[PDB]
Amino acid sequence: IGPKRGSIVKVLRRESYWFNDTGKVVAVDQAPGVRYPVVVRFDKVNYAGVSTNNYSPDELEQS
Amino acid sequence: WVTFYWHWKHITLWQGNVAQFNESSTYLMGWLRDYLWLNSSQLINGYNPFGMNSLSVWAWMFLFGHLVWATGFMFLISWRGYWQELIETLAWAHERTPLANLVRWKDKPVALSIVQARLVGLAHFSVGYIFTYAAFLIASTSGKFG
Amino acid sequence: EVKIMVEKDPVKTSFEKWAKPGHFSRTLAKGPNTTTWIWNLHADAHDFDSHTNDLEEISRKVFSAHFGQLAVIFIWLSGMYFHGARFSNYEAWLSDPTHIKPSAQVVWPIVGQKILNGDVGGGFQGIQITSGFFQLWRASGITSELQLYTTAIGGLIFAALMLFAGWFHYHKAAPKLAWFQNVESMLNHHLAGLLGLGSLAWAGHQVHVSLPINRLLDAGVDPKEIPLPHEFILNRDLLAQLYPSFSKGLTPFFTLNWSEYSDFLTFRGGLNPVTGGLWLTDTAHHHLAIAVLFLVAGHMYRTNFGIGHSMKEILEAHKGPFTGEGHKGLYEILTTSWHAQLAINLAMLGSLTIIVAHHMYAMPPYPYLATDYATQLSLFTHHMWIGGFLVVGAAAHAAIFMVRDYDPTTQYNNLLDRVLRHRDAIISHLNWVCIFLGFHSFGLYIHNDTMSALGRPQDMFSDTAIQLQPVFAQWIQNTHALAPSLTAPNATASTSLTWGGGDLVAVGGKVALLPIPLGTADFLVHHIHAFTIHVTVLILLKGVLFARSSRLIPDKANLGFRFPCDGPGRGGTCQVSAWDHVFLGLFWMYNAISVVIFHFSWKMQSDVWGSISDQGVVTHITGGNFAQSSITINGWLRDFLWAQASQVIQSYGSSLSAYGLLFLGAHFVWAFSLMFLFSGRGYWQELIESIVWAHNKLKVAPAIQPRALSIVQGRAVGVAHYLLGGIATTWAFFLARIISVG
Amino acid sequence: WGQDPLHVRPIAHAIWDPHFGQPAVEAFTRGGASGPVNIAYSGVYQWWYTIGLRTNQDLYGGSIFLLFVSALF
Amino acid sequence: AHSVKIYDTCIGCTQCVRACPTDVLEMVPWDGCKASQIASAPRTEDCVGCKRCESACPTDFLSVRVYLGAETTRSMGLAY
Amino acid sequence: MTASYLPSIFVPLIGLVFPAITMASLFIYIEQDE
Amino acid sequence: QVIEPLNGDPFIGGLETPVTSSPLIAWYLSNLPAYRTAVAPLLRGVEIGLAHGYLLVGPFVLAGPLRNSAVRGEAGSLAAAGLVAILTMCLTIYGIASFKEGEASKAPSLTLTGRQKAADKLQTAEGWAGFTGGFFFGGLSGVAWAYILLYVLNLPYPVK
Amino acid sequence: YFDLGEIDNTTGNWDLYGNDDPNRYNGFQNKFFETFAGAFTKRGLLLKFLVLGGATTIGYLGSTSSGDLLAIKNGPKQAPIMGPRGR
Numbered sequence A: 001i002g003p004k005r006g007s008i009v010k011v012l013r014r015e016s017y018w019f020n021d022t023g024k025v026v027a028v029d030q031a032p033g034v035r036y037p038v039v040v041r042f043d044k045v046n047y048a049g050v051s052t053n054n055y056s057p058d059e060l061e062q063s
Numbered sequence B: 001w002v003t004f005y006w007h008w009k010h011i012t013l014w015q016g017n018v019a020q021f022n023e024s025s026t027y028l029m030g031w032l033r034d035y036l037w038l039n040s041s042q043l044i045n046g047y048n049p050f051g052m053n054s055l056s057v058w059a060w061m062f063l064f065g066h067l068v069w070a071t072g073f074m075f076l077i078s079w080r081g082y083w084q085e086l087i088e089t090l091a092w093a094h095e096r097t098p099l100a101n102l103v104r105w106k107d108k109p110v111a112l113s114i115v116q117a118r119l120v121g122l123a124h125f126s127v128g129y130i131f132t133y134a135a136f137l138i139a140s141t142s143g144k145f146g
Numbered sequence C: 001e002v003k004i005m006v007e008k009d010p011v012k013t014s015f016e017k018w019a020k021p022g023h024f025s026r027t028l029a030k031g032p033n034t035t036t037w038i039w040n041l042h043a044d045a046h047d048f049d050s051h052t053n054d055l056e057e058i059s060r061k062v063f064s065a066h067f068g069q070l071a072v073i074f075i076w077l078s079g080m081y082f083h084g085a086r087f088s089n090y091e092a093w094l095s096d097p098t099h100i101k102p103s104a105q106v107v108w109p110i111v112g113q114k115i116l117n118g119d120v121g122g123g124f125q126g127i128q129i130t131s132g133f134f135q136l137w138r139a140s141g142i143t144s145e146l147q148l149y150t151t152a153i154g155g156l157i158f159a160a161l162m163l164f165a166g167w168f169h170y171h172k173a174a175p176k177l178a179w180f181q182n183v184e185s186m187l188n189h190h191l192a193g194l195l196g197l198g199s200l201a202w203a204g205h206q207v208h209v210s211l212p213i214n215r216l217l218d219a220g221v222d223p224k225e226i227p228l229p230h231e232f233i234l235n236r237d238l239l240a241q242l243y244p245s246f247s248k249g250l251t252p253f254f255t256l257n258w259s260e261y262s263d264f265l266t267f268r269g270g271l272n273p274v275t276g277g278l279w280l281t282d283t284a285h286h287h288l289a290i291a292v293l294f295l296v297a298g299h300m301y302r303t304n305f306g307i308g309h310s311m312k313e314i315l316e317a318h319k320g321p322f323t324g325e326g327h328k329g330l331y332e333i334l335t336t337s338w339h340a341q342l343a344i345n346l347a348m349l350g351s352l353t354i355i356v357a358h359h360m361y362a363m364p365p366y367p368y369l370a371t372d373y374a375t376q377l378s379l380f381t382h383h384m385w386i387g388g389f390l391v392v393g394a395a396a397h398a399a400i401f402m403v404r405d406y407d408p409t410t411q412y413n414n415l416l417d418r419v420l421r422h423r424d425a426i427i428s429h430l431n432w433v434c435i436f437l438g439f440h441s442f443g444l445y446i447h448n449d450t451m452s453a454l455g456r457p458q459d460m461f462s463d464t465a466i467q468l469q470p471v472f473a474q475w476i477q478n479t480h481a482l483a484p485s486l487t488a489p490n491a492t493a494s495t496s497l498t499w500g501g502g503d504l505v506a507v508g509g510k511v512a513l514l515p516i517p518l519g520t521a522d523f524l525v526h527h528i529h530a531f532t533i534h535v536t537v538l539i540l541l542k543g544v545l546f547a548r549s550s551r552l553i554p555d556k557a558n559l560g561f562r563f564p565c566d567g568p569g570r571g572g573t574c575q576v577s578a579w580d581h582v583f584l585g586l587f588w589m590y591n592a593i594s595v596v597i598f599h600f601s602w603k604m605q606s607d608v609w610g611s612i613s614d615q616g617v618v619t620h621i622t623g624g625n626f627a628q629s630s631i632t633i634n635g636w637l638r639d640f641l642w643a644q645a646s647q648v649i650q651s652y653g654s655s656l657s658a659y660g661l662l663f664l665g666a667h668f669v670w671a672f673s674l675m676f677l678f679s680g681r682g683y684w685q686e687l688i689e690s691i692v693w694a695h696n697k698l699k700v701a702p703a704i705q706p707r708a709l710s711i712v713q714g715r716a717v718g719v720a721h722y723l724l725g726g727i728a729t730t731w732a733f734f735l736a737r738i739i740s741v742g
Numbered sequence D: 001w002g003q004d005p006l007h008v009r010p011i012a013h014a015i016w017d018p019h020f021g022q023p024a025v026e027a028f029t030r031g032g033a034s035g036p037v038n039i040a041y042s043g044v045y046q047w048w049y050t051i052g053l054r055t056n057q058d059l060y061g062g063s064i065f066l067l068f069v070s071a072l073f
Numbered sequence E: 001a002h003s004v005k006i007y008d009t010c011i012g013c014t015q016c017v018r019a020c021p022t023d024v025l026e027m028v029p030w031d032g033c034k035a036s037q038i039a040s041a042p043r044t045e046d047c048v049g050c051k052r053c054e055s056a057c058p059t060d061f062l063s064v065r066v067y068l069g070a071e072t073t074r075s076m077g078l079a080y
Numbered sequence F: 001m002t003a004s005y006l007p008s009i010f011v012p013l014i015g016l017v018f019p020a021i022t023m024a025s026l027f028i029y030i031e032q033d034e
Numbered sequence G: 001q002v003i004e005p006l007n008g009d010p011f012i013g014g015l016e017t018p019v020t021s022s023p024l025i026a027w028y029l030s031n032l033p034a035y036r037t038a039v040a041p042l043l044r045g046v047e048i049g050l051a052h053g054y055l056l057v058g059p060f061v062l063a064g065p066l067r068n069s070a071v072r073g074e075a076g077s078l079a080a081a082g083l084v085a086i087l088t089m090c091l092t093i094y095g096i097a098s099f100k101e102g103e104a105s106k107a108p109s110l111t112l113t114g115r116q117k118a119a120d121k122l123q124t125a126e127g128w129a130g131f132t133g134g135f136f137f138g139g140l141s142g143v144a145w146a147y148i149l150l151y152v153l154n155l156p157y158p159v160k
Numbered sequence H: 001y002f003d004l005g006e007i008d009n010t011t012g013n014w015d016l017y018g019n020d021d022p023n024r025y026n027g028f029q030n031k032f033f034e035t036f037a038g039a040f041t042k043r044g045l046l047l048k049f050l051v052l053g054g055a056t057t058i059g060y061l062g063s064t065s066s067g068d069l070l071a072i073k074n075g076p077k078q079a080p081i082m083g084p085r086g087r
């Protein structure tokens, strides 16, 4: 599943720090039952200092 | 700022010399010296070692404002957990003092909570702010009418 | 076992570590990602314990940082001697100092600031200095500005030597950990080599240079015709005409005929009536005695020659039945922790600076120091602020020792473990005595304000109302005035003039010193002082004692020193940290030291400083109003904060108008502090998010993400502006008022 | 104050303070009063004069009427 | 007392439990992540409310969330 | 002043007695276990 | 060697210091009317009232507002008796709030040793009831006897 | 130090300064105090007459006081001080 590994996606999740921000997909989990399989890496950190977050494919579009 | 401008534009109008405001309101040392210092001449001399005037209640209410406003700083600068550990030591001291340990509390003594601390410091700041200016404004116009 | 352990070239002298800013910390070595990285870059710049876990490299960093500090102080002294040499009227002031003000700073005539070059006297224009360098150079025997220029270039040479030694003891030959752990040798060479030989060398200067030049300056001799300092050493008959005891020529020193040195080594006491400053025969006997006493005390500890003391053997033999295994491991505290030694040294240096402030208004060591009131007020005020800052930093590094260097395994059942074991009792009884002092001093002030407001002057605490005379101070001042007659025979006069031995010293028509009265007002303000010092001790000692843990947070030592809080839990854990107790003790140091210097300024402008006319009448600056107005807050606001501020606000259009500008800008920095102190991070973070949105709209977003300042950083910025603005307010008001009326 | 509104200070209410000394009683007695009184800086005299109230009985009747109005509320 | 809620964005990184100073959080099995575990708050009556778990949660936005509600002697952190 | 003695009565009750009525009755009320 | 934990227990928040468990101090504190656990609480409340009643005439006759008149005995004693009547109501509302009618005693029954003693009756709704009346009668008589010995008999003292 | 047979001795429920002496007075002193302080026992009764008796005793000497006893009943004894602008 997922759009593609190594692709550029835009986050549609409202409560994330990287909403409407360009991110790079580093891992998509193909195991069933995982709610947020797509792991997206960002060039900028959030207030917690991390750049790695998991999103569903419904919360991302290819840009 | 609004009522400083009102009271100094009018306190120079009422005794005639509007040129004092026209020359001195453009810079803040005129505001400090010709308004905050000059009009406070008979304010803080409301009571002296020599005697007390009719503005003495307005001289106490001015100092009273400088207490309460500054007391608000105690709630607006110092925050909760210092006072919580302080009241923890106070609770130990009351629970171990002979003749005073017999007296209990039903409410556990805690520090003021964080929203409550901001509200108490804000209300003290506001009470001191309204009493320092109510006193100065009602003592620097009613003692020097004009 | 004490010997030199160094090793050669630890780190290569390279600029590649200058280019990477956060090289010292592992978190900052990855580069910036937010704007808080810049603030943690400066916050962790000097924190050498957070860089490495090796105490050897930490101690080398501290040693070369000491050398860099010494280089900065020698650059500063080079500047102040170069300003005396080129930009001062020191020869003009030295011709006659009772009419010409000390000035050593010339401004450039650019934007209207040339009015700040005021008429200080002697055909000179410049900023009137209050640092006391002119009286210090008069006490040093400096006659010409060529000597000031030579001392400036010599200090520049020593500043280059400290920079070279800071490079040398980090990059060429840096000492190892056991070299710094030889504390017995360090105390032996600081007591004997530094404070003993330093006092002996300054005693030799005050025998050969300060004493004859300052004796000729008391005779009215012009400093251009006074012989140069080496002429007293060379022509010893010229030195013998001022003191006949020099005609014997060092033979009474080795034959123990020291009383034949009674011409130039005296125990006089008091002030020179010509100048108003202490005698240099007493200051030379003082330095010779503290040198023959610090050199004796420097031969106490055991280095490697057999004789001496192991101080672990001193400590471990000091154990008592109320403590048990006390004083044991404190040597391991004070040789493996830099912060514990920093706490003790900072407490002694701050308390010592407070000793310096009191022992300089009261026993003025320099000629025409007392009668130049600007110098006395500025020197007392400066040393009180430095002393208060250093004792708050003493409690700071005490708390950092607890959170980062206190090992509980090595400290069982000693003094420190038991002090931690009853810290609730210490903080609670300190809390009681602070509240008791607060009522019994400030509520006494409130009572005086209330009955003075209610028209009851007899219901007050005055010298005419219910009296509260300080009978212990009034007895210790009589004990120090009636001392020379029986308890201290060999004294010509008394230690200070402020004791009660008469001697109304008039220098230049201005009062140097006289008997200082102590009444109800002094009792009230000394109880204010004891109260404020006790409350500062309460916040600071609470932060030291509850740095490890509390009843609230039992794992507070894992959270560190500069952490904001645990969170909104347990009712709210805001400012639980030991850092936040240093942060609040900085405010209580402001309160304590500001009331100390306010009591100082009003007490000596009302009861000491003034003028003497004919037939022995003394008119003070604010005549006799300390005994009646300094018992109420309305008098403090009125006859001190309003009457004496009538020269800082109408100084505009004159040479003292920069004091008016910095008075107002100091009010600005104080009200700017109240922005950081009263607010919090999350509001400013969301406001910065709106500003970042406006930057994203116009494509001017920085990659270094704009962040609000941290909660520890916001409190630090607020207390820095609070201390800077309030201290600069008092600096501007003091240095305008006492220059204007002095 | 209705006879001479230019040279009479408007009195708010009397003061009964047990903490006054004799200077405070003698200094707060203003406006030709029999004791220590507070001078009204609320502009209620100017208001009640302009609106039509002249005597103390009219103000007392207004106070009873607004006691009745507050009781009704 | 305090209500601690775990959301389905959790990755099972366990550091919310490791940061907990009053043993509120525990890791139960789950099927919605690679670690196959989610946090839960059974002893939420023992929660002081310190939000150390929210400080240690790397998920944006947070998976553990503490809501400060009614406060009792557990959540006030008193010893007297 | 019409009646000078009602200053001497109501200011002690509303200044001393009425807070001693109100604060003691509230402290009973706020510490009722119910 | 001198400092012990409280009854041998190091984890109770106290210590057996010389200011706490001296031969002289623990004799004193055990005879003071507040720590008599078997005396009826009206009788020992009269001694807590006589004491505090007496001592409070002093700061009210020598420091009060009417201290410079011939009415300084009458003004300060009724001021001292006024603080008795306020603290009686403070003692009244404390026993209403803390103790409920029909409850047990909120008191430690066990002594310093392991022996079991009877419950202290002062921390009850009826024990603090008789304690409050003991403070009222003892306090008003402690003020009046200190007023009698100072401004009726007028005994010679350096300050009065 | 935990026992599970005496829960009060292992938690800090200690009469640290208490005494178990039954009596130390005599019967003549004890019967005098309980007779006089017998109408002051009940908390609800004592709170009633202290409020009602306390309100009367401050209104009595507030009103029967003289000029020398209290300055607020003395009144002005000099000419009034005229303010500025003829007010």
Ligand code: CLA
Pocket (backbone or CB within 6 Å): C011, C012, C013, C014, C015, C017, C018, C019, C021, C023, C024, C060, C061, C062, C064, C065, C067, C068, C069, C072, C163, C164, C166, C167, C170
């Ligand atoms: C130019 C010669 C030279 C060079 C190339 C090096 C090389 C090195 N030094 Mg340095 N060192 C030297 C001279 C030299 N040093 C001297 C003179 C001292 C004595 C102070 C030392 C003592 C020393 C210490 C103890 C440390 C090093 C370390 C470092 C490394 C980088 C630190 C850094 O970012 O520096 C750039 C630093 C600065 C630009 C700050 C200098 C501040 C100076 C002293 C002035 C401060 C006061 C000034 C008036 C400003 C006041 C405020 C102002 C607003 C008025 C690097 C290997 C560090 C290291 O290897 O650890 C990882 C280390 O901890 N050095």
Ligand code: CLA
Pocket (backbone or CB within 6 Å): C063, C066, C067, C070, C161, C179, C180, C182, C183, C185, C186, C189, C190, C192, C193, C194
């Ligand atoms: C008799 C020898 C002696 C003397 C005079 C001193 C003097 C000094 N020591 Mg040192 N020290 C010595 C031996 C000595 N040390 C021993 C044996 C130990 C090893 C156990 C130490 C280890 C030690 C450390 C780790 C540090 C010092 C520091 C200090 C300085 C005090 C800080 C200050 O501002 O003072 C006033 C400063 C001055 C008056 C400046 C004087 C500088 C000149 C060039 C003399 C210093 C060189 C040398 C020590 C003596 C040469 C004598 C020469 C004049 C003929 C000062 C330079 C502190 C410091 O600042 O580090 C740099 C520091 O913490 N000392």
Ligand code: CLA
Pocket (backbone or CB within 6 Å): C042, C043, C044, C045, C046, C047, C048, C342, C346, C389, C390, C392, C393, C394, C396, C397, C400, C561, C562, C579, C582, C583, C586, C720, C724
């Ligand atoms: C002998 C002096 C001494 C020693 C060795 C130190 C050493 C240290 N202090 Mg400090 N301390 C002392 C005394 C001293 N302090 C005093 C005087 C205070 C009271 C203010 C404290 C309070 C204290 C606390 C509260 C803490 C330390 C900490 C630090 C550590 C690193 C701080 C750093 O990186 O610098 C950072 C330097 C700056 C940010 C420069 C700012 C300078 C001030 C704050 C503002 C500017 C003032 C200036 C005069 C105004 C000019 C305005 C103009 C430019 C417009 C280091 C161990 C910190 C730590 O973590 O310790 C391990 C810390 O948390 N200190």
Ligand code: CLA
Pocket (backbone or CB within 6 Å): D018, D019, F011, F012, F014, F015, F016, F017, F018, F020, F021, G064, G065, G066, G075, G076, G078, G079, G081, G082, G083, G085, G086, H050, H051, H054, H055, H057, H058, H061, H070
């Ligand atoms: C409106 C409020 C109110 C009023 C009416 C008074 C009234 C009084 N104050 Mg007080 N006070 C108050 C508020 C009040 N206070 C508060 C808020 C403060 C705190 C900042 C103070 C602080 C203060 C102190 C520190 C003292 C006064 C004193 C006085 C007395 C001055 C007159 C005099 O010379 O008598 C001289 C004294 C007498 C004639 C003695 C009379 C005592 C009577 C007989 C008490 C009788 C029992 C009492 C009524 C029971 C009350 C029950 C309850 C329902 C209220 C007078 C009784 C002084 C005094 O003497 O207190 C008694 C004094 O020392 N006041």
Ligand SMILES: CC1=C(C/C=C(\C)CCC[C@H](C)CCC[C@H](C)CCCC(C)C)C(=O)c2ccccc2C1=O
Pocket (backbone or CB within 6 Å): B074, B075, B076, B078, B079, B080, B081, B083, B084, B110, B111, B112, B113, B114, B117
């Ligand atoms: C002093 C202080 C305390 C201690 C303050 C306490 C415990 C308040 C209680 C002290 C007395 C009871 C206040 C009495 C003053 C008023 C007369 C109370 C009037 C309230 C009624 C109107 C309801 C805090 O708890 C605190 C918490 C967080 C930030 C700052 C602070 C803080 O500065």
Ligand SMILES: CC1=C(C/C=C(\C)CCC[C@H](C)CCC[C@H](C)CCCC(C)C)C(=O)c2ccccc2C1=O
Pocket (backbone or CB within 6 Å): C675, C676, C677, C679, C680, C681, C684, C685, C707, C708, C709, C710, C711, C713, C714, C715
């Ligand atoms: C204002 C404020 C901020 C915001 C403060 C900020 C963002 C610091 C601003 C620093 C400067 C002005 C910005 C950086 C300047 C750069 C060097 C760029 C130069 C541009 C000009 C200055 C030349 C907080 O973060 C805060 C946190 C906690 C409590 C109170 C507060 C608080 O009051």
Ligand code: SF4
Pocket (backbone or CB within 6 Å): E006, E009, E010, E011, E012, E013, E014, E015, E016, E017, E038, E039, E053, E056, E057, E058, E059, E062, E063, E064
């Ligand atoms: S810290 Fe957050 S992401 Fe990690 S297990 Fe706990 S709730 Fe899940």
